[PDB]
């Protein structure tokens, strides 16, 4: 119980809960993938081999972006992922050959998002042949018996071409929600939480194609979250804070920019709702700090994350 001459307390690469030396994952985490999943075998490819497969398969896959990714199915009885080109059930993101600790960063950041009540798909880390960690996330547009749900990103919805990521604004993002979502006021609360979250965790890369609407449960809503990571600590010499301007600003954002201009003037949220969300963030910060300390980020990357988080929290008076 003192962890002085024995392994430090181990944490699950899916849930971050305490696990024993003989376990690689917690039962709770494995069962988020499937109630019958017994284990998750390491990927039989090194990080470099995963990146090469990503390059070879990109044109055959139904998901695309800047970073290296693979599509995969979960073989439940065999207890492993299988790489596929079509009908992916999961996306796998191997280590970058450029940026440090990208899978570990995205994994913990997506977990922080879940803890503040954002809708986040099942996600986690899986070991590789070279002991490197690869990030995985469930496809939220393929459910049940390989049934596809309709999904469109905000570039498509705002009449831009498929490459437009930055030539937009948070005000245009709001306008898309107002135009298309079934219950825009509910989605505005979600966008408020997501935008504060991205500021607190250093995600300066929440671009237009990271916003999507989905048709599910007999309504059109903002999709489950994807691609949330602390991009500031993974990059060097980052100066901007927001990918898309708010009030014409991508840097030097103020508390009133978020809590008055954005929350009240642009989103129309009632003051009691704003205060309640602020209190939610205030209460969650110690849990986030604990989770970062339990994460698979290196000690040095944890310190960068915690330092930035505390700076951003001070700017919003969330302490
Ligand atoms: N869990 C998920 N379920 C369904 N679709 C997903 C998904 N995650 C990502 N996608 C789809 O794949 C696209 C690219 O995803 P993502 O943004 O994570 O790529 P990426 O890792 O290459 C980083 P970047 O955004 O900088 O290109 C998304 O816009 C979305 O259409
Ligand atoms: Mg990005
Ligand atoms: Mg992004």
Residue numbers in the entry: -7 to 311
From the paper:
Here, we perform structural and biochemical characterization of the Legionella pneumophila effector Lpg2370, demonstrating that it is a Ser/Thr kinase. Notably, the toxin Lpg2370 (HipTLp) and the antitoxin Lpg2369 (HipSLp) correspond to the C-terminus and N-terminus of HipA from HipBA TA, respectively. Structural analysis reveals that HipSLp binding induces a loop-to-helix shift in the P-loop of HipTLp, leading to the blockage of ATP binding and inhibition of the kinase activity.
The structure of pHipTLp–ATP reveals that AMP–PNP is bound to the P-loop like in other representative kinases. The backbone of pHipTLp in the complex is virtually identical to the apo structure (RMSD = 0.35 Å), with the exception of P-loop that bends towards helix α2 to accommodate the AMP–PNP. In pHipTLp, the γ-phosphate of AMP–PNP is stabilized by V58, H199, and D219, the β-phosphate forms hydrogen bonds with Q59, K61, and K85, whereas the α-phosphate interacts with K85 and N202. The adenosine moiety interacts with the main chain of K130 and forms π-stacking interactions with the side chain of F132.
